[PDB]
Design an enzyme around this catalytic site. Structure first.
Site, short mmCIF file in Angstrom:
data_model
loop_
_atom_site.label_atom_id
_atom_site.label_comp_id
_atom_site.label_asym_id
_atom_site.label_seq_id
_atom_site.Cartn_x
_atom_site.Cartn_y
_atom_site.Cartn_z
N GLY A 117 0.78 -1.15 0.00
CA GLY A 117 0.00 0.00 0.00
C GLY A 117 0.86 1.26 0.00
N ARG A 152 -1.84 -0.54 -8.92
CA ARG A 152 -0.90 -0.53 -7.78
C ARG A 152 0.53 -0.29 -8.29
NH1 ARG A 152 -1.82 -2.85 -3.08
NH2 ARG A 152 -3.31 -4.37 -3.98
N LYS A 154 2.70 4.76 19.62
CA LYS A 154 4.07 5.23 19.43
C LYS A 154 4.76 5.63 20.71
CE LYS A 154 3.13 6.67 14.69
NZ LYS A 154 2.47 7.73 13.95
N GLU A 203 12.34 1.61 13.12
CA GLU A 203 12.44 3.05 13.03
C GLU A 203 11.22 3.69 12.37
OE1 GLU A 203 15.21 5.25 14.18
OE2 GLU A 203 13.29 6.39 14.00
N1 LIG Z 1 0.92 5.92 5.74
C1 LIG Z 1 1.86 6.35 6.59
O1 LIG Z 1 2.19 7.53 6.60
C2 LIG Z 1 2.49 5.40 7.54
C3 LIG Z 1 3.72 5.80 8.12
C4 LIG Z 1 4.28 4.98 9.06
C5 LIG Z 1 3.71 3.82 9.47
N2 LIG Z 1 2.52 3.45 8.90
C6 LIG Z 1 2.01 2.15 9.27
O2 LIG Z 1 2.39 1.30 8.19
C7 LIG Z 1 1.41 0.23 8.01
C8 LIG Z 1 0.86 0.32 6.61
O3 LIG Z 1 0.28 1.57 6.34
P1 LIG Z 1 -0.21 2.03 4.91
O4 LIG Z 1 -0.53 3.46 4.87
O5 LIG Z 1 0.68 1.46 3.91
O6 LIG Z 1 -1.55 1.01 4.76
P2 LIG Z 1 -2.27 0.74 3.35
O7 LIG Z 1 -2.05 1.72 2.35
O8 LIG Z 1 -3.65 0.47 3.83
O9 LIG Z 1 -1.56 -0.62 2.95
C9 LIG Z 1 -1.75 -1.86 3.56
C10 LIG Z 1 -1.30 -2.95 2.66
O10 LIG Z 1 -1.25 -4.22 3.31
C11 LIG Z 1 -2.27 -5.01 2.60
N3 LIG Z 1 -2.86 -5.81 3.59
C12 LIG Z 1 -3.46 -5.24 4.76
N4 LIG Z 1 -3.95 -6.22 5.53
C13 LIG Z 1 -3.71 -7.39 4.83
C14 LIG Z 1 -4.09 -8.78 5.04
N5 LIG Z 1 -4.68 -9.15 6.17
N6 LIG Z 1 -3.65 -9.72 4.17
C15 LIG Z 1 -3.00 -9.41 3.06
N7 LIG Z 1 -2.71 -8.12 2.72
C16 LIG Z 1 -2.97 -7.11 3.62
C17 LIG Z 1 -3.13 -4.17 1.76
O11 LIG Z 1 -3.73 -4.88 0.60
P3 LIG Z 1 -4.52 -3.99 -0.50
O12 LIG Z 1 -3.73 -2.86 -1.17
O13 LIG Z 1 -4.77 -4.97 -1.72
O14 LIG Z 1 -5.72 -3.74 0.33
C18 LIG Z 1 -2.12 -3.08 1.36
O15 LIG Z 1 -1.28 -3.53 0.25
C19 LIG Z 1 0.31 0.53 9.08
O16 LIG Z 1 0.72 -0.33 10.16
C20 LIG Z 1 0.44 1.99 9.40
O17 LIG Z 1 0.07 2.33 10.74
C21 LIG Z 1 1.95 4.24 7.95
N1 LIG Z 2 -1.51 7.66 10.69
C1 LIG Z 2 -0.13 7.90 11.13
C2 LIG Z 2 0.89 7.54 10.02
C3 LIG Z 2 2.39 7.68 10.39
O1 LIG Z 2 2.81 6.78 11.42
C4 LIG Z 2 -0.03 9.36 11.44
O2 LIG Z 2 -0.86 10.22 11.00
O3 LIG Z 2 1.00 9.68 12.14
NA NA Z 3 11.35 7.08 12.77
#
Ligand SMILES: NC(=O)c1ccc[n+]([C@@H]2O[C@H](COP(=O)([O-])OP(=O)(O)OC[C@H]3O[C@@H](n4cnc5c(N)ncnc54)[C@H](OP(=O)(O)O)[C@@H]3O)[C@@H](O)[C@H]2O)c1
Ligand SMILES: N[C@@H](CCO)C(=O)O
Ligand code: NA
Ligand SMILES: NC(=O)c1ccc[n+]([C@@H]2O[C@H](COP(=O)([O-])OP(=O)(O)OC[C@H]3O[C@@H](n4cnc5c(N)ncnc54)[C@H](OP(=O)(O)O)[C@@H]3O)[C@@H](O)[C@H]2O)c1
Ligand SMILES: NC(=O)c1ccc[n+]([C@@H]2O[C@H](COP(=O)([O-])OP(=O)(O)OC[C@H]3O[C@@H](n4cnc5c(N)ncnc54)[C@H](OP(=O)(O)O)[C@@H]3O)[C@@H](O)[C@H]2O)c1
Ligand SMILES: NC(=O)c1ccc[n+]([C@@H]2O[C@H](COP(=O)([O-])OP(=O)(O)OC[C@H]3O[C@@H](n4cnc5c(N)ncnc54)[C@H](OP(=O)(O)O)[C@@H]3O)[C@@H](O)[C@H]2O)c1
Ligand SMILES: N[C@@H](CCO)C(=O)O
Ligand SMILES: N[C@@H](CCO)C(=O)O
Ligand SMILES: N[C@@H](CCO)C(=O)O
Ligand code: NA
Ligand code: NA
Ligand code: NA
EC number: 1.1.1.3
Lengths: 332, 331, 332, 331
Positions: free
Chosen positions: A12, A50, A195, A121
């Protein structure tokens, strides 16, 4: 020269930025004697348009046990947990961006963190150095920690200060790729609390419970509340605080009235502010969400692993706070 | 003929099904002397392919105060809250499918619900008549309520009975349009808890807090556990329960071992089962998720409004349970 | 009041515009005593982001025999043919936008066209009146017909006249939704030839063979060729012509040098120009491709059917040309 | 170290697999003293999600004349032709996967092929070594050639043998990335005919016209016909054939009844079978479609170029067939 076999869980916002970054930096990697080889990228739906080649996408079962690294950015707790644990038990490291996972499944994951198998990190302030920053703070004893750890809610507050509405700033944050798929995790302070938990465990107590963090969000704040603060010489921010009360560490997330010239009030992005003994007052700021920001942290951790360094080890011992503390005033 | 002016918040699985249902059924509204006219449709990404005219999409919030009705299916809590409150303040009804909004923002929304301004049939079991079922059940005093309120989790457990994996069943639930954007809301019991709160509020305590619902989900269930249950003449389902304990209403969501011939175990679709005084034991079942299913509930509410009927009212007072009860055994 | 049950084959450029148009005009339909009810929309991939609700999408088998109308916009020949034929044999009308189908599968489809079961205004110049125009021309005898029938190639020529390149005008035409999925059908004149065939069959000979159309495309044309024409007082266009030679009807598609003030050279969109006896010279122009343009034709045909009119019947008899003719000069 | 400057035309199934392969394998190029640098990637829609950096996408054509190599996989004929000819005119090689382009625009492209400027391994059987196979077969005089060149059609017939429907098999071929944008090019035999033309040109007549290939496709085949064939110890496949008739080379594509133990019938993947003088009978088989498979052929050509080897040359003269032949029976 040798291959570095990566299994990526999640494709994602974060996972697709990481995949592309890894291949874009394959020249850097060769300087470390490695060439990157993805084994597969676990996703839900292979047909979604994607930014990863369709052929590399996988549905479970996706075997991880030939990997040199598992990289996880799925989100949630139970789904990633059940996938990573067999790889951790086989001694394969995990690089993760998932604070929730670590905060909520620490009984299962702590023993692997203690072995140096978990790099995270990117789970706090994305690729902004937060964990590495605190590790170096271990040279001192913490006095107090205060951070603005949630990107989505920082964005929304900043935009409301400028007279924009909550609902349009949320929409923007979501388009920017900042928000959790359940945006109440952001706005209610829960993601910040996850966090905060991790920061407490790295520094002050390797068993600090997520359940002990008191959290409240930004749902009472409006452009008017924020504009009135500005008129008082203040800025209101959601702040995650670790501080001593009664000889125990307390952890809270809440809106705070900050002096407008405080480092936390003037931050460029998410921010972590500490006072420690004998170091003094130190601060780190940068982007705390976004796909590329996060991919940077995951890739930093990948370079860290290639260096021969372990993952982010919890605090070796729990110690009480040296100093009685408190947060800033709350918002009435 | 006059316009019935609608502002739609959300153009996704539910909002697009709704938009397209209203257009297909538009001739029906001429019985009330109206033709439906959408003022705008709030969405995040106006470039996604969508079965709603480009000219009506609003990628930013727009003035709602000329509407006759606001229809909401955008998801989350604080954003829809802030968007609908000025309309509600102006006496413009809200028709919503969003259980989370109502469960979590009730301090703000309760006063408007009490004035008949909030219609939310589609927030519980989609267009299956759950809230009208309970409205008629108010003829009696509640003894106990047990439902299977979450569509996604029901679908997963039923498919896992048939030998599919948890994962494959979840994926099919998502493709069917059933799941929340974060499916943990489904499988952890949180969506069922939001809906359970609304049921409690309608029946027994108009101030029932979402925070007092105990919820767990299906994470510990394996196809083994489901097959041992069958060996015992049981089925395991996620069940939402409202029952008296110590003179107070309890609310809980958890996996339950049901006798296999209980209505809840056998039901075709999501299900709501009550016992009440003097009625007895009554039951309703039907689809509990899906765009068309939900659009049917929203449109049923729109016809309710056009008929001159108020929205769904909270219980006029709190009262204690007549009888002590319990759920089924846990797993 | 009664339902009009539609089975739609195809949910693409044309099919999605038609679905939305039908529901957008459901108030018009009620004035005809009908309410529209789609039975399903046949597509290939249900997961593609698409301007139809996902729940209405279908994969074969998709039974059509409860429909009051089948509407087809799949493209190709054999795939639609095998789906429509069981519905035509059951006496269910077909409304189609697919010239190729009709041009290439006329041995199978002619007998149903002769019964009034096939409506295909949208197969030539989209919702611009071309078939209805020729039907009214039957009051006269054709002398000569010349049309600019391919939207994609008209667009490209127009853009090259302005000094833009072939490749950027093609790309635009494709984004605009004008082109066949095989763009050589457009640029080689084949799609124009399909359409010419249909016009010949409606007016002059109900068995006119598609194989008899001579076609060549625009692949030798450049901004320079077109700019030189302009300097000669000419415009070059791809033109589809039906004309007498030797007492037989000849059909050709080719680039032509037109006088720049000819109706065909100054057309606003695709255009059909005829001379007939005793009417004289007549002309029709409008958009000839695009989803909404096409949806308009399909919906016109749906209203035509609700009126009690039959579909587009082929010419009742083949007649030779009254007059020896020719096209404009070709391009050297 | 110097840049190898690449202009990529097309960023789809093949172009994105290629882009990402070059980046993953970039260290290999340091043996030749280069690092790969993309000047731009031509695409139609720069907003689609794509595994290529946004900053490198060109939604309009861009100057190619600083490139060291142009790599083409955009599909169609006249647009890629017009885009590559100025690069070819400047002595910049073309690496292409586009059989249609070469088959249909050969009057324009032949002179550059003759100068060694066109590499097109990936245009026939993807990265399976078909064209290098035939280059080594030039040690002998061709007697006859028979291949199964179309990936999509092979996949469909093999799945239909296993009981899947034509429709379901086509859909899976499309999801696997095998099919042309118009799948009738596959199932009508046109793609196989384009590839057959190229083979004829490499081996026996450098001016062989695409228009002289007879082609039919698989529209008349049912799972019945395929099962009757099996009952006869046969398999039915779409086969591309090059053989002597009356002193002239014929080229045909059609469904053929093959003995079930013939290499063509049994092959794992697409296949090319020859008999030649004095070699004998030789055969190559492998994946004939798919992004990664194709990217392997394009990258093999890029390494060929870096080695100092010319592109794939047409036969140095036409010559007549040594022997009379025929295809297998039709269906
Ligand atoms: N976005 C940010 O700024 C950010 C920054 C730091 C940390 N995070 C953390 O990083 C993680 C991912 O965030 P994100 O923004 O990338 O989420 P996202 O865009 O919703 O991506 C999640 C991905 O994992 C897949 N997925 C989720 N659950 C699954 C399951 N049970 N089985 C198989 N595939 C699965 C999804 O499939 P589909 O695409 O096909 O649905 C998608 O490819 C989260 O833990 C979030 O808290 C996010
Ligand atoms: N949803 C989280 C993504 C980054 O960890 C935020 O807004 O900080
Ligand atoms: Na960091
Ligand atoms: N699916 C069901 O079966 C079902 C049934 C009953 C009730 N519900 C409830 O109905 C609501 C909608 O569910 P759904 O399945 O339709 O979700 P969905 O498909 O995700 O649609 C949500 C819609 O709201 C838009 N949106 C979301 N956040 C927004 C914001 N901050 N600003 C502006 N627009 C925003 C999205 O825009 P884009 O399209 O541009 O992203 C989309 O149009 C939820 O409250 C859910 O709990 C669902
Ligand atoms: N575009 C125009 O301007 C225009 C104008 C007039 C006439 N036409 C004609 O109208 C027809 C449709 O054109 P278009 O632009 O709409 O094509 P398009 O965008 O390619 O749409 C074709 C649709 O039919 C589906 N489909 C195609 N073959 C199928 C198969 N064998 N089985 C199941 N589903 C199938 C596709 O599925 P997916 O979406 O899942 O692939 C898609 O929904 C063509 O005959 C064309 O010549 C076009
Ligand atoms: N798929 C295979 O297995 C395979 C194997 C060997 C050879 N081939 C050949 O390789 C070529 C590409 O096939 P593919 O499967 O990769 O097709 P694809 O996925 O449709 O990709 C085509 C690419 O070219 C772009 N494009 C198309 N027309 C364009 C134009 N007029 N202007 C600018 N950009 C344009 C598309 O842009 P968007 O992405 O923006 O639409 C896309 O990036 C074809 O010639 C095909 O015959 C395919
Ligand atoms: N996610 C919800 C949708 C219907 O309210 C469910 O599965 O029940
Ligand atoms: N490809 C066709 C579509 C309209 O029939 C054209 O350009 O005319
Ligand atoms: N459509 C082509 C792709 C590979 O050239 C095939 O199926 O063979
Ligand atoms: Na309901
Ligand atoms: Na027309
Ligand atoms: Na090859």
């Amino acid at each position: 020269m040798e291959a570095l076999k990566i299994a990526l869980l999640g494709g994602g916002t974060v996972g697709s930025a990481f995949y592309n970054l890894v291949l874009e930096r394959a020249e850097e990697l060769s300087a470390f004697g490695v060439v990157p080889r993805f084994l597969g990228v676990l996703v839900r739906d292979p047909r979604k348009p994607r930014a990863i080649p369709q052929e590399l996408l996988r549905a479970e079962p996706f075997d991880l046990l030939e990997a040199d690294l598992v990289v996880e950015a799925m989100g949630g707790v139970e789904a990633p947990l059940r996938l990573v644990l067999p790889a951790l038990e086989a001694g394969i490291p995990l690089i993760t961006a998932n604070k929730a996972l670590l905060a909520e499944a620490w009984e299962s994951l702590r023993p692997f963190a203690e072995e140096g198998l978990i790099y995270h990190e990117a789970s706090v302030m994305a690729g902004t150095p937060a964990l590495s920053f605190l590790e170096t703070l271990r040279g001192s004893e913490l006095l107090e920690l205060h951070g603005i750890l949630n990107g989505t809610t920082l964005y929304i507050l900043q935009e409301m200060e400028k007279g924009r509405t909550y609902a349009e700033a949320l929409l923007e944050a979501q388009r920017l790729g900042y928000a959790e798929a359940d945006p109440t995790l952001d706005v209610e302070g829960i993601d910040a609390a996850h966090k905060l938990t991790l920061l407490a465990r790295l520094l002050v107590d390797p068993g600090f419970p997520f359940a002990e963090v008191e959290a409240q969000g930004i749902a009472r704040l409006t452009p008017e509340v924020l504009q009135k603060a500005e008129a008082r010489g203040e800025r209101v921010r959601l702040v995650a605080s670790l501080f001593g009360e009664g000889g125990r560490w307390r952890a809270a997330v809440a809106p705070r009235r900050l002096p407008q010239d405080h480092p936390l009030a003037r931050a460029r992005g998410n921010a972590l502010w500490v006072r420690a003994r004998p170091l003094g007052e130190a601060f780190v700021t940068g982007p705390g969400a976004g796909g590329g920001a996060t991919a940077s942290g995951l890739f930093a951790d990948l370079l860290r692993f290639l260096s021969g360094a372990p993952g982010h080890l919890p605090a070796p011992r729990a110690r009480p706070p040296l100093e009685e503390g408190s947060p800033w005033p709350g918002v009435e």
